[PDB]
Design a protein around this ligand. Structure first.
Ligand SMILES: Nc1nc2c(ncn2[C@@H]2O[C@H](COP(=O)(O)OP(=O)(O)NP(=O)(O)O)[C@@H](O)[C@H]2O)c(=O)[nH]1
Ligand SMILES: [Mg+2]
Length: 166
């Protein structure tokens, strides 16, 4: 069957693993469990198409940047995750996108911009600022909450559709 190699990237603690575990295991993980590098593989039916979602969950730790070129190189599509209550994570989005472009030798790469932790009332990044950034990249912007599940499937499934149209 068709396989989609998805790679979740973003600064430490923005909820990359929480979003990936919500989608696969239907549970909100609220534990301190920094990620090194993990892979999830699950059969799903998306728009009637049988396909394998192969999702690599990456570390936000910079200690692993050699490990980064490698997985970014094999990825078909990317979820760039920042948190709506961490302005630095939003700023560090540029760095991840510009690394992806250089590892993929392409101006355009299937990608979705994800503003996570939207269940929290203490917001420091305005949805409009993120939307404007996404618009300049030419990619869609989706706000998610791993804790309530808002926009989770949407984020992942959309990315798959952007891969389909590439
Ligand atoms: N309120 C709220 N907390 C969230 C949300 N997503 C993740 N968190 C919390 O944020 C913390 C970090 O989540 P985690 O998924 O481990 O982040 P990560 O990006 O995978 N970290 P790392 O880069 O180290 O692997 C956890 O305490 C988790 O419960 C969310 O949507 N809402
Ligand atoms: Mg993690």
């Amino acid at each position: 069957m068709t396989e989609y190699k998805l790679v979740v990237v973003g600064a430490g603690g923005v909820g990359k693993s929480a979003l990936t575990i919500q989608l696969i295991q239907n549970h909100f993980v609220d534990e301190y469990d920094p990620t090194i590098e993990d892979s999830y593989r699950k059969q799903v039916v998306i728009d009637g198409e049988t396909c394998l979602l192969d999702i690599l969950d990456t570390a936000g730790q910079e200690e692993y940047s050699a490990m980064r070129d490698q997985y970014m190189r094999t990825g078909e599509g990317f979820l760039c995750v920042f948190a709506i209550n961490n302005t630095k994570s939003f700023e560090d989005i540029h760095q991840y996108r510009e690394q992806i472009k250089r590892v993929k030798d392409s101006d355009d790469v299937p990608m979705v911009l994800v503003g996570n932790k939207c269940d929290l009332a203490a917001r420091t990044v305005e949805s409009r600022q993120a939307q404007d950034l996404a618009r300049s990249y030419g990619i869609p912007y989706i706000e998610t909450s791993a804790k309530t599940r808002q926009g989770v499937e949407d984020a992942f499934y959309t990315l798959v559709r952007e891969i389909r149209q590439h």
